[PDB]
Amino acid sequence: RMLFQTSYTLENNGSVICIPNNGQCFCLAWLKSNGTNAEKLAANILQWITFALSALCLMFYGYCGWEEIYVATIEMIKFIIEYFHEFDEPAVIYSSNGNKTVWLRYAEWLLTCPVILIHLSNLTGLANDYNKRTMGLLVSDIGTIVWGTTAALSKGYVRVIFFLMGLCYGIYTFFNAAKVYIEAYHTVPKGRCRQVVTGMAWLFFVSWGMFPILFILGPEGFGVLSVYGSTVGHTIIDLMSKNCWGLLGHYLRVLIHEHILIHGDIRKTTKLNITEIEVETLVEDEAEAGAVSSED
Amino acid sequence: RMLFQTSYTLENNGSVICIPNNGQCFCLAWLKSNGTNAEKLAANILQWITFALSALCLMFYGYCGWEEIYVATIEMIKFIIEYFHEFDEPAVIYSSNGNKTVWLRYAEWLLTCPVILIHLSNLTGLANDYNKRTMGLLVSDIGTIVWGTTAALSKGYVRVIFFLMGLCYGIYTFFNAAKVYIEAYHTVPKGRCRQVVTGMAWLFFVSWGMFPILFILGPEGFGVLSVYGSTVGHTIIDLMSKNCWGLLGHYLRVLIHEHILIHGDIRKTTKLNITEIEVETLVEDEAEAGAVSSED
Ligand SMILES: *[C@@H]1O[C@H](CO)[C@@H](O[C@@H]2O[C@H](CO)[C@@H](O)[C@H](O)[C@H]2NC(C)=O)[C@H](O)[C@H]1NC(C)=O
Ligand SMILES: *[C@@H]1O[C@H](CO)[C@@H](O[C@@H]2O[C@H](CO)[C@@H](O)[C@H](O)[C@H]2NC(C)=O)[C@H](O)[C@H]1NC(C)=O
Ligand SMILES: CCCCCCCC/C=C/CCCCCCCC(=O)OC[C@H](O)CO
Ligand SMILES: CCCCCCCC/C=C/CCCCCCCC(=O)OC[C@H](O)CO
Ligand SMILES: *C\C=C(C)/C=C/C=C(C)/C=C/C1=C(C)CCCC1(C)C
Ligand SMILES: *C\C=C(C)/C=C/C=C(C)/C=C/C1=C(C)CCCC1(C)C
C-alpha cells in the first residue's frame, strides 16, 4: 500500500540495492512490520470502542463545559484520520535516520494539553481567574511534550538527553498538579464531590505517569513493544486520559453548580500547610463560614 | 557531511539507482542544495548577531521578569544547536515524502508560546490573576502551531487543509490578542508607558503576521524561498519576535513598577466599548480615581 519505494532488487549478493529512479524516498527501516495480526486486531477493536465513547460523550454533553467537549472533538477527528490514514505520513513520520514517529499522537497532546491543564485549574467551574501556578503548569507540560517529541525524532545519546530534559520539565508538572488536586479536595463540599476529585486524581496520575513508561517501551525507546502493541497500550490510557477524565470532570462540574442551586455559594477559609496555602471551602451549612487552619 | 546515503550509481541510463546495502535511508529529495553561498553567509552573520543580542539580554536581565529571560534562555540553546547541528536530524527532519522540516524552529515556538502569551496577559507585571481570554489565546495559538507543523510535514491537498485549519485558529488568536493590547493601553499611566505598549503592539502584529507569510514562501509552501533564504527571513523576524519584544517588555515592567515606587497604585474605572469591557487605569494623580466610560 505504501507511497515510499517498496520494490527493489538485491545485487552483488545483497551488498547493493537497486531501485527505480522514480523520485520516491527509500529506506529498509520503514518496511519493517508493525506487529502481529492479533496485535492489529486488538488495536482496531479498542479504536472503534474509543470512537464509540468519543461519540457518546459528545452527544451526552449536547443536552462552561467547553474543555470536555473539545477533547472529545479532537478525539473524533483523530479516529476519522486513523480509519483512512493511520500509517500514512504525517500521521506517522518516516524520517531519514529510519525512525517511525506517531505525530498523530503528539499533535493531539499539544492541541489539548492547555485545554486539560486549564480544566485542571478549573475543577469546580466556579473560578473566573487563574493563578501564577496554572501558567507554570502549561509552560512545563508543553516543554515536556516538545523535548519528548524531539527525543522520539532523535537516536542514540541525543534521544537520551532530550528524554531527560522532558523528565525534568515533567517532574515540575507532576509536583505542581499534585498541589492543585490537594486544593480542589479542600475547596469542594464534604460529600460526593470529594469522592469524584479523589477519582480524578487517581485517573490523572496513573494515566499521565504511563506515557513516559510507554515511550521507553515503544520503538521511540528500547523497541520492546511493536507499533500495534504501542497502539493498544495508548488506546487503554487514551480512554482514561481523555474520555473518562472529561466525563468525571463534567459530572463534578454539574454537582458543584447544583450545590449553588440548592445551598448557594457558602465559602470558608481552610488555611492548608502541605507551605502556607489558603482555600475557599464550599459548605452546605450557612453557619460554617470561618477560618479553619488545617495544617497538613 | 550527511548521515543518510549520499553515494549512488546511475544504471540503465539513469532509470535505476544502485546504493550500498549499508542500512542507510536514501532519497534524492534530501540532497538538493539549501541555497547560494551568499544566502548562507548572510544567514551565518544574522545568527551570530542573534547570539550576541540573546547573550546581552540575558546578562542585562541578571542585574517577575521570568518570561523575558526564558525566551533568551531558549534562544541561546537554539544557537549552540545551530552552531553544531543546524541541518542534522532532528534540527531538520528529512521525511519519506521528501520534505525537509525545520523542527528546531517549531519546537522553540511551542516551548515559549505559553511564556510569550502569559507575558501578553501580563504587560504591567502587576496582575496575579489571568482571565478566561488568556486561556483561549493559549488554546488557539498552540492549535495554530500544531496544524502548521502538520501542514509542513504533509504535501498536496493535505498540506492545504492543515494550513487553512491553522489560519482559522490564528485569526481567533490575532482577534483576541488585539483586545488585550487595547486594554493594556488604557490600563498603564498616560505618558511614556503608552508609547512602549504601542511599540510592543506594532512589533507583535508585524512579526507574528510575517510567520504564515514566510511559511507560504518557503519549502513548506510554494518553494519560492531556499532554505538559507528562509533562515535569513526567520533571523530578522526572530530578533523582533523574541529579543526586542522581551526587552520592550522588561522596559515597560520597570516603568510600571517605578510608578508604584513614586506615585503608588492609583487605579481608575475606564469602561471601554471596543462590547462592554472595563479597565483599572493607573494614574500619577491621587485625585483621579473615578469611572470614565470611554466608549470606543
Ligand atoms: C555472499 O554474502 C553472504 C553473506 O551472508 C556470505 O555468506 C556467509 O559468509 C560468511 C563468511 O565470511 C560466513 O560467516 C557465513 O556463514 C556465510 N553464510 C551466511 C548464511 O551468512 C558469502 O560469503 C558472500 N559471497 C561473496 C562472494 O561475497
Ligand atoms: C536514455 O535516457 C534518456 C533520457 O534523457 C533518453 O534521452 C532522451 O530521449 C528522449 C526521446 O524519448 C528525447 O525526447 C530527449 O531529447 C533525449 N535527450 C535528453 C537529453 O533528454 C534516451 O532515449 C534513453 N535511452 C534509452 C536506450 O532508453
Ligand atoms: C515522573 C514520571 C514517572 C515515571 C517516568 C519514568 C522515567 C524514565 C527514566 C529512565 C532512565 C533511562 C534512560 C531513558 C532514555 C531514553 C532513550 C532511549 O530509550 O534510547 C533508546 C536506545 O538508545 C536504543 O535501544
Ligand atoms: C491572519 C494572518 C495574516 C496573513 C496570513 C496569510 C494567509 C495565507 C493564505 C493563503 C491561501 C492560499 C493557500 C495556502 C495553502 C498552503 C499549502 C501550500 O503551500 O502547498 C504547496 C503546494 O501544494 C506546492 O507548490
Ligand atoms: C491526550 C491526552 C493526554 C493526557 C496526553 C498526555 C501525554 C503525556 C503526559 C506525555 C508525557 C511525556 C513525558 C512525561 C516524558 C517523556 C515524553 C512524553 C511526551 C511521552
Ligand atoms: C519564537 C517566537 C515566535 C513569536 C514564533 C511565532 C510563530 C507563529 C506566529 C506561527 C504562525 C503560523 C500561522 C499563523 C499559520 C501558519 C502556520 C504557522 C505555525 C507558521
Side-chain angles (χ1 to χ4, degrees), chain A residues 159-189 191-221:
Chain A
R159 163 175 294 176
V160 173
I161 302 164
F162 285 109
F163 184 89
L164 291 183
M165 291 176 74
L167 205 60
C168 302
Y169 272 68
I171 293 150
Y172 185 98
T173 308
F174 279 106
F175 184 73
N176 282 282
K179 302 199 200 118
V180 170
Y181 272 108
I182 288 166
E183 293 195 11
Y185 180 85
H186 293 94
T187 296
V188 301
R192 188 189 287 198
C193 289
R194 295 193 179 200
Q195 285 162 223
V196 172
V197 167
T198 285
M200 292 186 75
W202 270 99
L203 264 192
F204 182 86
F205 285 115
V206 168
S207 63
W208 285 52
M210 269 296 100
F211 283 101
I213 302 307
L214 284 191
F215 186 107
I216 287 160
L217 292 185
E220 328 88 74

Coordinates of all heavy atoms in Angstrom, one line a residue, chain A residues 159-221, unseen atoms left out:
Chain A
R159 N 18.8 11.3 21.7 CA 17.4 10.9 22.3 C 17.5 10.8 23.8 O 16.5 11.3 24.4 CB 17.0 9.5 21.7 CG 15.9 8.8 22.4 CD 15.5 7.5 21.7 NE 14.9 7.8 20.4 CZ 14.5 6.9 19.5 NH1 14.6 5.6 19.7 NH2 13.9 7.3 18.4
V160 N 18.6 10.3 24.4 CA 18.7 10.1 25.9 C 18.6 11.5 26.5 O 17.8 11.6 27.5 CB 20.0 9.4 26.3 CG1 20.1 9.4 27.8 CG2 20.1 8.0 25.8
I161 N 19.3 12.5 26.0 CA 19.4 13.9 26.6 C 18.0 14.5 26.6 O 17.6 15.0 27.7 CB 20.4 14.7 25.8 CG1 21.8 14.1 25.9 CG2 20.3 16.2 26.4 CD1 22.8 14.7 24.8
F162 N 17.3 14.5 25.4 CA 16.0 15.2 25.3 C 15.0 14.5 26.1 O 14.2 15.2 26.8 CB 15.6 15.3 23.8 CG 16.4 16.4 23.0 CD1 17.4 16.1 22.1 CD2 16.2 17.7 23.3 CE1 18.1 17.1 21.5 CE2 16.9 18.7 22.7 CZ 17.8 18.4 21.7
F163 N 15.0 13.2 26.3 CA 14.1 12.4 27.2 C 14.3 13.0 28.6 O 13.3 13.3 29.3 CB 14.3 10.9 27.1 CG 13.3 10.2 28.0 CD1 12.1 9.8 27.4 CD2 13.5 10.0 29.4 CE1 11.1 9.2 28.2 CE2 12.5 9.4 30.1 CZ 11.3 9.0 29.6
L164 N 15.6 13.1 29.0 CA 16.0 13.5 30.4 C 15.5 15.0 30.6 O 15.0 15.3 31.7 CB 17.5 13.4 30.6 CG 18.0 12.0 30.7 CD1 19.5 12.0 31.0 CD2 17.3 11.0 31.7
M165 N 15.6 15.8 29.6 CA 15.1 17.2 29.6 C 13.6 17.2 29.8 O 13.0 18.0 30.6 CB 15.5 18.0 28.4 CG 16.9 18.3 28.3 SD 17.4 19.1 26.7 CE 16.8 20.7 27.1
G166 N 12.9 16.3 29.1 CA 11.4 16.1 29.2 C 11.1 15.7 30.6 O 10.1 16.2 31.2
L167 N 11.8 14.8 31.2 CA 11.6 14.3 32.6 C 11.7 15.4 33.6 O 10.9 15.5 34.5 CB 12.6 13.1 32.9 CG 12.1 12.2 34.0 CD1 10.8 11.5 33.6 CD2 13.1 11.1 34.3
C168 N 12.8 16.3 33.5 CA 13.0 17.4 34.4 C 11.7 18.4 34.3 O 11.2 18.7 35.4 CB 14.2 18.3 34.0 SG 15.8 17.4 34.0
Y169 N 11.2 18.7 33.1 CA 10.0 19.5 33.0 C 8.8 18.8 33.6 O 8.0 19.4 34.3 CB 9.8 19.8 31.5 CG 10.5 21.1 31.0 CD1 11.9 21.2 30.9 CD2 9.8 22.2 30.6 CE1 12.6 22.3 30.5 CE2 10.4 23.3 30.1 CZ 11.8 23.4 30.1 OH 12.3 24.6 29.7
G170 N 8.7 17.5 33.3 CA 7.6 16.6 33.7 C 7.5 16.5 35.2 O 6.4 16.6 35.7
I171 N 8.6 16.4 35.9 CA 8.6 16.3 37.4 C 8.0 17.6 38.0 O 7.2 17.5 38.9 CB 10.0 16.1 38.0 CG1 10.6 14.7 37.6 CG2 10.0 16.3 39.5 CD1 12.2 14.8 37.5
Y172 N 8.4 18.8 37.5 CA 7.9 20.1 37.8 C 6.4 20.1 37.6 O 5.7 20.6 38.5 CB 8.5 21.2 37.0 CG 8.1 22.6 37.4 CD1 8.9 23.4 38.3 CD2 6.9 23.1 37.0 CE1 8.5 24.7 38.7 CE2 6.5 24.4 37.4 CZ 7.2 25.2 38.2 OH 6.8 26.4 38.6
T173 N 5.9 19.5 36.5 CA 4.4 19.4 36.2 C 3.7 18.6 37.2 O 2.7 19.1 37.7 CB 4.2 18.9 34.8 OG1 5.0 19.6 33.8 CG2 2.8 19.0 34.3
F174 N 4.2 17.4 37.5 CA 3.6 16.4 38.4 C 3.4 17.1 39.8 O 2.3 17.0 40.4 CB 4.3 15.1 38.4 CG 3.9 14.2 37.2 CD1 4.8 14.0 36.2 CD2 2.7 13.6 37.1 CE1 4.5 13.2 35.1 CE2 2.4 12.8 36.0 CZ 3.3 12.6 35.0
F175 N 4.6 17.6 40.2 CA 4.7 18.2 41.6 C 3.6 19.3 41.8 O 2.9 19.2 42.8 CB 6.1 18.8 41.7 CG 6.5 19.4 43.0 CD1 6.7 18.6 44.1 CD2 6.6 20.7 43.2 CE1 7.1 19.1 45.4 CE2 7.0 21.3 44.4 CZ 7.2 20.5 45.5
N176 N 3.5 20.2 40.8 CA 2.5 21.3 40.9 C 1.1 20.8 40.6 O 0.2 21.3 41.3 CB 2.9 22.5 40.0 CG 4.0 23.3 40.6 OD1 3.8 24.1 41.5 ND2 5.2 23.1 40.1
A177 N 0.9 19.8 39.8 CA -0.5 19.3 39.5 C -1.0 18.6 40.8 O -2.2 18.7 41.1 CB -0.5 18.3 38.4
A178 N -0.1 18.1 41.7 CA -0.4 17.4 42.9 C -1.0 18.4 43.9 O -2.0 18.1 44.6 CB 0.8 16.7 43.5
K179 N -0.4 19.6 44.0 CA -0.9 20.7 44.9 C -2.3 21.1 44.5 O -3.1 21.3 45.4 CB 0.1 21.9 44.8 CG 1.6 21.6 45.2 CD 2.3 22.8 45.5 CE 3.8 22.7 45.4 NZ 4.4 23.6 44.4
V180 N -2.5 21.2 43.2 CA -3.8 21.7 42.6 C -4.9 20.7 43.2 O -6.0 21.2 43.6 CB -3.8 21.7 41.1 CG1 -5.2 22.0 40.5 CG2 -2.8 22.8 40.6
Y181 N -4.7 19.4 43.1 CA -5.7 18.4 43.4 C -6.0 18.4 45.0 O -7.1 18.3 45.4 CB -5.2 17.0 43.0 CG -5.6 16.6 41.6 CD1 -4.6 16.6 40.6 CD2 -6.9 16.3 41.3 CE1 -5.0 16.2 39.3 CE2 -7.2 15.9 40.0 CZ -6.3 15.9 39.0 OH -6.7 15.5 37.7
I182 N -4.9 18.7 45.7 CA -5.0 18.9 47.2 C -5.9 20.1 47.5 O -6.8 20.0 48.3 CB -3.6 19.1 47.8 CG1 -2.8 17.8 47.8 CG2 -3.6 19.7 49.2 CD1 -1.3 18.0 48.1
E183 N -5.7 21.2 46.8 CA -6.5 22.5 47.0 C -8.0 22.2 46.5 O -8.9 22.6 47.2 CB -5.9 23.6 46.1 CG -4.6 24.1 46.6 CD -4.1 25.4 46.1 OE1 -5.0 26.1 45.4 OE2 -2.9 25.7 46.3
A184 N -8.2 21.5 45.4 CA -9.5 21.2 44.9 C -10.3 20.4 45.9 O -11.5 20.7 46.2 CB -9.4 20.4 43.6
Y185 N -9.6 19.4 46.6 CA -10.2 18.5 47.5 C -10.8 19.3 48.7 O -11.9 19.0 49.1 CB -9.2 17.4 48.0 CG -9.7 16.4 49.0 CD1 -10.4 15.3 48.5 CD2 -9.6 16.7 50.3 CE1 -10.9 14.4 49.5 CE2 -10.1 15.8 51.3 CZ -10.7 14.6 50.8 OH -11.2 13.7 51.7
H186 N -10.0 20.2 49.2 CA -10.4 21.0 50.4 C -11.2 22.2 50.0 O -11.6 23.0 50.9 CB -9.1 21.5 51.2 CG -8.4 20.4 51.8 ND1 -7.3 19.7 51.2 CD2 -8.5 19.8 53.0 CE1 -6.9 18.8 51.9 NE2 -7.6 18.8 53.1
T187 N -11.5 22.4 48.7 CA -12.4 23.5 48.2 C -13.8 23.0 48.1 O -14.8 23.8 48.5 CB -11.9 24.1 46.9 OG1 -10.6 24.7 47.1 CG2 -12.8 25.1 46.3
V188 N -14.1 21.8 47.6 CA -15.4 21.3 47.2 C -16.2 20.9 48.4 O -15.5 20.5 49.5 CB -15.3 20.2 46.1 CG1 -14.6 20.6 44.9 CG2 -14.7 18.9 46.7
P189 N -17.5 20.8 48.4 CA -18.3 20.3 49.5 C -17.9 18.9 50.0 O -17.3 18.1 49.2 CB -19.7 20.2 48.9 CG -19.8 21.2 47.9 CD -18.4 21.2 47.3
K190 N -18.2 18.5 51.3 CA -17.6 17.4 52.0 C -18.0 16.0 51.6 O -17.3 15.1 51.9 CB -17.9 17.6 53.5
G191 N -19.1 15.9 50.8 CA -19.7 14.5 50.5 C -19.1 13.9 49.2 O -17.9 13.7 49.2
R192 N -20.0 13.7 48.2 CA -19.7 13.0 46.9 C -18.7 13.7 46.1 O -17.9 13.0 45.4 CB -21.1 12.9 46.2 CG -21.0 12.0 45.0 CD -22.3 12.0 44.2 NE -23.4 11.4 44.8 CZ -24.6 11.0 44.2 NH1 -24.8 11.2 42.9 NH2 -25.5 10.3 44.9
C193 N -18.7 15.1 46.1 CA -17.8 15.9 45.3 C -16.3 15.6 45.6 O -15.5 15.5 44.7 CB -18.1 17.4 45.5 SG -19.6 17.8 44.7
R194 N -16.0 15.3 46.9 CA -14.6 14.9 47.3 C -14.3 13.5 46.9 O -13.1 13.2 46.7 CB -14.4 15.1 48.8 CG -14.5 16.5 49.2 CD -14.1 16.8 50.7 NE -14.2 18.2 51.0 CZ -13.6 18.9 51.9 NH1 -12.8 18.2 52.8 NH2 -13.7 20.2 52.1
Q195 N -15.3 12.6 46.7 CA -15.1 11.3 46.1 C -14.6 11.4 44.6 O -13.6 10.7 44.3 CB -16.3 10.4 46.2 CG -16.6 9.9 47.6 CD -18.0 9.4 47.8 OE1 -18.7 9.7 48.8 NE2 -18.5 8.8 46.7
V196 N -15.3 12.3 43.9 CA -15.1 12.5 42.4 C -13.7 13.1 42.2 O -12.9 12.6 41.4 CB -16.1 13.4 41.8 CG1 -15.8 13.7 40.3 CG2 -17.5 12.8 41.8
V197 N -13.3 14.1 43.0 CA -12.0 14.8 43.0 C -10.9 13.7 43.2 O -9.9 13.8 42.4 CB -11.8 15.9 44.0 CG1 -10.4 16.4 44.1 CG2 -12.8 17.1 43.6
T198 N -11.1 12.9 44.2 CA -10.2 11.8 44.5 C -10.1 10.8 43.3 O -9.0 10.5 43.0 CB -10.6 11.1 45.8 OG1 -10.2 12.0 46.9 CG2 -9.9 9.7 46.1
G199 N -11.2 10.4 42.7 CA -11.3 9.6 41.5 C -10.5 10.3 40.3 O -9.8 9.5 39.6
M200 N -10.6 11.6 40.2 CA -10.0 12.3 39.1 C -8.5 12.3 39.3 O -7.7 12.2 38.2 CB -10.5 13.8 38.9 CG -11.9 13.8 38.5 SD -12.6 15.5 38.2 CE -11.8 15.9 36.6
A201 N -8.0 12.4 40.5 CA -6.6 12.5 40.9 C -5.9 11.1 40.5 O -4.8 11.2 39.9 CB -6.4 12.7 42.4
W202 N -6.6 10.0 40.9 CA -6.1 8.7 40.6 C -6.0 8.5 39.0 O -4.9 8.2 38.6 CB -7.0 7.6 41.2 CG -6.7 7.2 42.6 CD1 -7.2 7.7 43.7 CD2 -5.7 6.2 42.9 NE1 -6.7 7.1 44.8 CE2 -5.7 6.2 44.4 CE3 -4.8 5.4 42.2 CZ2 -4.9 5.3 45.1 CZ3 -4.0 4.6 42.9 CH2 -4.0 4.5 44.3
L203 N -7.1 8.8 38.3 CA -7.1 8.7 36.8 C -5.9 9.5 36.2 O -5.2 9.0 35.4 CB -8.4 9.1 36.3 CG -9.5 8.1 36.0 CD1 -10.6 8.7 35.2 CD2 -8.9 6.9 35.2
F204 N -5.8 10.7 36.7 CA -4.8 11.7 36.2 C -3.4 11.2 36.3 O -2.7 11.1 35.3 CB -5.0 13.0 36.9 CG -4.1 14.1 36.3 CD1 -4.4 14.9 35.2 CD2 -2.9 14.4 36.9 CE1 -3.6 15.9 34.8 CE2 -2.0 15.4 36.5 CZ -2.4 16.1 35.4
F205 N -3.0 10.9 37.5 CA -1.6 10.5 37.8 C -1.2 9.1 37.2 O 0.0 8.9 36.8 CB -1.3 10.5 39.3 CG -1.1 12.0 39.8 CD1 -2.0 12.5 40.6 CD2 -0.1 12.8 39.3 CE1 -1.9 13.9 41.0 CE2 0.0 14.1 39.7 CZ -0.9 14.6 40.5
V206 N -2.2 8.1 37.2 CA -2.0 6.8 36.6 C -1.7 6.9 35.1 O -0.7 6.4 34.6 CB -3.1 5.8 36.9 CG1 -3.0 4.5 36.1 CG2 -3.2 5.4 38.4
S207 N -2.7 7.6 34.5 CA -2.7 7.7 33.0 C -1.5 8.6 32.5 O -0.8 8.1 31.7 CB -4.1 8.3 32.5 OG -4.3 9.6 33.0
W208 N -1.3 9.7 33.2 CA -0.2 10.6 32.8 C 1.1 10.0 33.1 O 2.1 10.1 32.2 CB -0.4 12.0 33.5 CG -1.4 12.9 32.8 CD1 -2.7 12.6 32.6 CD2 -1.3 14.2 32.3 NE1 -3.4 13.6 32.0 CE2 -2.5 14.6 31.8 CE3 -0.2 15.1 32.3 CZ2 -2.7 15.9 31.3 CZ3 -0.4 16.4 31.8 CH2 -1.6 16.7 31.3
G209 N 1.3 9.3 34.2 CA 2.5 8.5 34.5 C 2.9 7.4 33.5 O 4.1 7.1 33.3
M210 N 1.8 6.8 32.9 CA 2.0 5.7 31.9 C 2.6 6.2 30.6 O 3.1 5.3 29.8 CB 0.7 5.0 31.7 CG 0.4 3.9 32.6 SD 1.6 2.5 32.4 CE 2.7 2.9 33.8
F211 N 2.6 7.4 30.3 CA 3.0 7.9 28.9 C 4.5 7.8 28.8 O 5.0 7.2 27.8 CB 2.5 9.3 28.6 CG 1.0 9.3 28.2 CD1 0.0 9.6 29.1 CD2 0.6 8.8 27.0 CE1 -1.3 9.6 28.8 CE2 -0.7 8.8 26.6 CZ -1.7 9.2 27.5
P212 N 5.3 8.4 29.7 CA 6.8 8.2 29.7 C 7.2 6.7 29.7 O 8.2 6.3 29.1 CB 7.4 8.9 30.9 CG 6.1 9.3 31.7 CD 4.9 9.2 30.8
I213 N 6.4 5.8 30.4 CA 6.6 4.4 30.5 C 6.5 3.7 29.1 O 7.4 3.0 28.7 CB 5.8 3.7 31.6 CG1 6.0 4.3 33.0 CG2 6.0 2.2 31.6 CD1 7.4 4.4 33.5
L214 N 5.4 4.1 28.4 CA 5.1 3.5 27.1 C 6.1 4.1 26.0 O 6.4 3.3 25.0 CB 3.6 3.8 26.7 CG 2.5 3.0 27.4 CD1 1.2 3.2 26.7 CD2 2.9 1.5 27.4
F215 N 6.7 5.3 26.3 CA 7.7 5.9 25.4 C 8.9 5.0 25.5 O 9.4 4.5 24.4 CB 8.0 7.3 25.8 CG 9.0 8.0 24.9 CD1 8.5 9.0 24.1 CD2 10.3 7.7 24.9 CE1 9.4 9.7 23.3 CE2 11.2 8.4 24.1 CZ 10.7 9.4 23.3
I216 N 9.5 4.7 26.7 CA 10.7 3.9 26.9 C 10.5 2.5 26.3 O 11.4 1.9 25.8 CB 10.9 3.9 28.5 CG1 11.5 5.2 29.0 CG2 11.9 2.7 28.8 CD1 11.4 5.4 30.4
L217 N 9.2 1.9 26.4 CA 9.0 0.6 26.0 C 8.8 0.5 24.4 O 9.0 -0.6 23.9 CB 7.7 0.0 26.7 CG 7.8 -0.2 28.2 CD1 6.5 -0.8 28.7 CD2 9.0 -1.0 28.6
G218 N 8.4 1.6 23.8 CA 8.0 1.5 22.3 C 9.2 1.7 21.4 O 10.3 1.8 21.9
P219 N 9.0 1.7 20.1 CA 10.0 1.9 19.1 C 10.8 3.2 19.3 O 12.0 3.2 19.0 CB 9.3 2.1 17.7 CG 8.0 1.3 17.9 CD 7.7 1.4 19.4
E220 N 10.2 4.2 19.9 CA 10.9 5.5 20.4 C 11.9 5.3 21.5 O 12.6 6.3 21.8 CB 9.9 6.6 20.9 CG 8.5 6.5 20.3 CD 7.6 5.6 21.0 OE1 7.1 5.9 22.1 OE2 7.3 4.5 20.5
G221 N 12.0 4.1 22.1 CA 12.9 3.9 23.3 C 13.7 2.7 23.1 O 14.7 2.8 22.3

